[PDB]
């Protein structure tokens, strides 16, 4: 069918391999679907556009990625199929080409996808299109646990689509592609079962939200919501997180450290503020800070007001010798002293009108209340820029940021309403993938909430790779949802993924 | 009775490689090429080198890799395939006197041989060649594709074997007479019986080994890399200082953009800013500027000193923006701000985190808008070539200084004049640069593969086709000639550079004299 | 002769393919290679190649581990100087004939390459294909080493992945003997090439290659030089009545060449400093010379990841030392004179030889008119000596090198010793000081940058004049030597032999004890 030359799989391996491995003949007797391999044809598509792009390997059937686990390598070809889903009244082409395993990768036009071994396919076909996938290699087999360069197969979309169309809907042409192996694969060495392998799928923890701990103020998460008249793009330091497992910002580890910190304290009695006291930071688990690439010590506040903290004060007058204070610090945007917790020095002060004889020495600081509350990064220097994280986005047209929403202790006189707080992860999600250091596969996955009991689905969203979570909204006015459902991955999803609208 | 002849000839002995055969199974194709490759000698890309009286045995003359690279009718070729097997075939030739002596050896290295340092003693432990200076006649070798693969990949450059060249005695001439006299020689290869590429593709022209090449624009014609001005002038000077550190206008060859330098020519020595006014009651106008990218993005304090395009250079300035008043009768104008770029101890300027001060005297209090701002430049006052105030009194990020160079060689510098403020003296100010626009961009356009250290071109005259010096271009984006003169020496402005070759480090060029 | 136990485990089937060797190779090379047919006919010692089973072992330990490739012969690992690649397989001799009041079982795998190093388990060393062997099988065991791999050969001046062989103390080692000792069990390896081993192309023959295991200087340690303080060496002894783990700072080097600490190069920079000198008359104290020190060569110091200058004493106690001046009066030009300094913390320390700052002082009643300029200052004489680290910062934090150990238990530390100019009012002991290793070894490993193997070394010193052995000691990679001793009261040898080496040997190796 297509100019290229047979291929020899285990004929090439036997001679310097240990074992040669044989699989189930029951797998060989069914297609399969494919990782990332569906698409859509609408009529306002152009020519050029990739509808597909998978590369040859284990990682394509289930069943091989959960038998790749005993093994150290693989050899050998595979079988496809492509369906598409059209009829006797349309019109267009697409075209499937065989892209060998080290051509550069970047645009393609659709002129040079006609150069490689290929198949041009007529949208009015009535049986699935049948092509293999061929081990071209410098080597003599693949690694299991490690992705190396393999044959590709691309699909270009040729000529455009032509049809009508009714006064409700679009008619888009859909297609989908499933594998199997060719009766020349094989596997190569039996080793003891990896857990940590490379073709394992993300998942998240069996939690309700209301159970959970905020990332950004240490309390219960009260409410999950979405609200579009609000910053559609903040910069929040905290609660950052990437799916691989990579801290982003000044996000920690454990919920113990948010919004509060440790430093070394010095303190002294002016006749105007009262007493006030130096903090030169540090780490909370005691090791040292160097000024870095990020805005601050890992847990330090990051919005705008007037706080107050308690601290372990020591005085070494008679009849006295422990208790605790409290002090009022302002970390306000563009507050008249000299804030720079980036060099790693903070200022607070307390009223007094004596020397209260404070030793010094080491000191943890914890919020208790928040004055003129904004939400609004702090003075991380005088004036001048700081390493931060990039505001969370870009979304798709229509889509929106999901909050967990949390409620601080206030300080007023004339409103009495509640003070709300909002993040992007719960702080178990930080460590579940800190801990767990999943590897990514394209760009989002699909999750799932869900009822436990009645199992009824509320909503569908779009977890990215940086760690925020979009729905399609369509209205105005916030809308909240149930906190007692949970979460279910449902698999990788290309960035140009239109979900289901809600409400 | 037997016979031993003293006088053998040459002729390396070899073992036969495989080269299809042993690719064939695992490949999905196996093309041929024309017939006729294999009957001819062309130059190589790295072709040209030389031997100077100024060399010591054991210095590396020249150093080849097996591959397509080697030939401009395969380099051709590779454009369209994915990958390469086979042998080749390399010639030598060299020009020399009778009044010269010396020996060089050619020796076969194979992959994966440590790359550190070969002495004299060891260079004759590999399939090796013994030459001589005065030979009339070209001297050719093998080259044979040990490897551990089964085929090499036509766009990365993996291991193969290699061809090496040592300087084995010393060049002497007996009277010297001309004790500058320079050997040249010249590399030719062609594929031998065995050679094959691998699986058809379409032809992207933006692939390694695409010969680099240079806009057909004189230098008169050109834009400034440091002053937005036209370029006027183009020299060497020993008497100025050999290493400078400039910022702007520097561009590696492969298309990596160092310092601070921008794309388009309109980005220099300007800035972008959020503004904020106020009216200190003593001096006048003061403006704080917050500095953002000239494309609308935000600026992050990273690698570089400042945003893209500001200004690397020394002295008061004067700039223009515009400005919305408040005031009733007037909507709009350009107002004139001084700025200070040199550190004296005052103003605390640090671009690099993002904030800068301006002011304007009046004993009025113009209640400007604040808003969103772009500072171009308007004239210079006590100007200095240094660089400016970047930190307040820090250390931050920098491209390193020009160099190094070979002994006798020099810096050309393309060389533009300011507008300047001065009460004193009328002579022009002047401002050079290594490279000028349109040679920053063509790269980063282009993504060239250097495959050597150095290029050599030629200068010439548009109409006469006549050759006015030779230089290097080094591929940190500099350009190097041999002169020993002791002042200024200038050229005309309406030549074409050519691309010659690429040639290694130790080159040595024909000098030039006024 | 008694068959009171396991003859061979000659036959253990062994799950595997045969494995082209050289063959797959050959159209890939450009020239025809051979090795030696009579290296093909004898079993011969690796250089790793001895090992210790003993009671104090749990299971779970690994006892040895093997990568295939020209280190296991040491004619292979001589021809691989002189080429660029290798290919083959291998075939190994085990012995284990341990006693017959003995029980116990080991386990040997043949682990692939790719798989991750550090873990494995008791329980996933049956998951490969293996051998159980008992500790009291009389013949050797003969063992199979593959070349498993995806390429046509691999680099010898690289260490690529390639097929281990990994042996794991399965059961605990008991010995139901009627008195008062469990034997050990000492196990030796040898290997030789299969039938298909080759190499690929002829190189230049180069001594420092990664294979080439260590040598020792032929020097008896009694015409050496303490490498902390400057006279001859005088003692070898272990006495376990002294600190176990020490911070010396001068004479720590790496088997691999790098210098630890503040250990300079030459024996002469040894508890001496050069700095700038400036000099005052205080009408208390006298004479006050302040000294900003730098580098002994004349370079300049910078406080880095180093606690002082190289060559900077690291002990305490009150130092005194000489010192060149010259004076600007008339009739006396040059001459030497004599300071004072306070090494220790003393709660009062000025000084802080970690930014280069020095104060030392000497009794005058009329000012010497002493002229500033450079100066170095060597030792004389030392008064109140502790063997703790100075004050190199007032009463700050320092980068350090680490303390010397861990041991196994039963283990000292082996000590060079010399004797100290003091001064001393009411006793006439003469005053000693120990170091790990002499400056010629010093030396010789910052010259000779050898390629370490698994942990360490095991040496034997012998004695010149008879040719007797004496003892047996294990050399740590990080750079000190250990016995086995067990006694109360020291122990001191004879200075007049020479180290050897004998093989490579990991952390858990068991010596014999001493005497
Ligand atoms: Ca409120
Ligand atoms: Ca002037
Ligand atoms: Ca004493």
């Known amino acids: 069918a297509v100019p290229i030359q047979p291929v020899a799989g285990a004929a090439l391996a036997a001679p310097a391999a240990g074992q040669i491995n044989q699989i189930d003949p029951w797998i060989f007797q069914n297609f399969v679907q494919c990782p990332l391999g569906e698409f859509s044809i609408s009529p306002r598509n152009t020519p050029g556009e990739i509808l597909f792009d998978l590369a040859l390997g284990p990682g394509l059937n289930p069943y091989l990625a959960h038998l790749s686990a005993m093994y150290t390598g693989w050899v050998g070809n595979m079988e496809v199929q492509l369906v598409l889903a059209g009829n006797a009244f349309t019109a267009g082409k697409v075209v499937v080409a065989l892209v060998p395993p080290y051509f550069?990768?970047?645009?393609?036009?659709?002129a040079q996808i006609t150069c490689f071994p290929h198949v041009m396919c007529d949208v009015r076909t009535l049986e699935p299109i049948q092509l293999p996938l061929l081990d071209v290699r410098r080597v003599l087999w693949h690694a299991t646990q490690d992705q190396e360069e393999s044959?590709?197969?691309?699909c270009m979309l040729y000529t455009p689509l032509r049809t009508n169309s009714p006064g409700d809907e679009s008619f888009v042409v859909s297609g989908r592609l499933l594998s199997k192996p060719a009766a020349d694969f094989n596997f190569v060495y039996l080793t003891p079962p990896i857990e940590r392998t490379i073709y394992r799928m993300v998942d998240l923890p069996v939690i309700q939200p209301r159970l959970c701990t905020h990332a950004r103020w240490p309390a219960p998460v009260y409410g999950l919501l979405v609200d579009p008249s609000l910053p559609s793009n903040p910069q929040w330091q905290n609660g950052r997180v990437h799916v691989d497992g990579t801290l982003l910002g000044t996000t920690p580890i454990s919920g113990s450290w948010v919004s509060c910190f440790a430093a070394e304290a010095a303190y002294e009695f002016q006749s105007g503020t009262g007493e006030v006291a130096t903090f030169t930071?540090?780490?909370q688990d005691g090791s040292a800070y160097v000024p870095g690439d990020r805005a601050?010590?890992?847990?330090?506040?990051?919005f705008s007001g007037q706080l107050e903290i308690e601290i372990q004060t020591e005085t070494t007058k008679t009849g006295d010798k422990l208790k605790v204070t409290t002090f009022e610090m302002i970390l306000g945007p563009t507050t008249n002293a000299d804030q720079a917790p980036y060099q790693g020095?903070?200022?607070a002060s307390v009223?007094?009108?004596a020397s209260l004889d404070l030793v010094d020495g080491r000191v943890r600081a914890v919020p208790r209340s928040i004055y003129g509350f904004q939400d609004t990064i702090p003075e991380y220097n005088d004036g001048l820029l700081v390493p931060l994280a990039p505001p969370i986005g870009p979304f798709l047209p229509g889509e929106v940021l999901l909050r967990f929403r949390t409620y601080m202790r206030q300080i007023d006189t004339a409103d009495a309403a509640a003070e709300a707080i909002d993040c992007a992860l719960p702080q178990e999600f930080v460590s579940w993938f800190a801990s767990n250091a999943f590897?990514?596969?394209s760009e989002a996955l699909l999750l799932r909430y869900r009822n436990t009991l009645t199992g009824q689905l509320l909503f569908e969203c779009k977890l990215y790779n940086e760690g925020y979570i979009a729905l399609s909204y369509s209205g105005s006015g916030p809308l909240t949802f149930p906190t007692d459902g949970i979460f279910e991955v449902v698999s990788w999803v290309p960035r140009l993924y239109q979900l289901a609208s809600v409400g």
């Open 104 to 110: 550069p990768k970047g645009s393609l036009t659709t």
């Open 351 to 353: 009223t007094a009108a």
């Open 439 to 441: 590897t990514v596969q």
């Open 345 to 347: 020095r903070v200022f």
């Open 151 to 154: 044959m590709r197969l691309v």
């Open 296 to 302: 601050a010590p890992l847990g330090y506040p990051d």
């Open 281 to 283: 930071l540090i780490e």
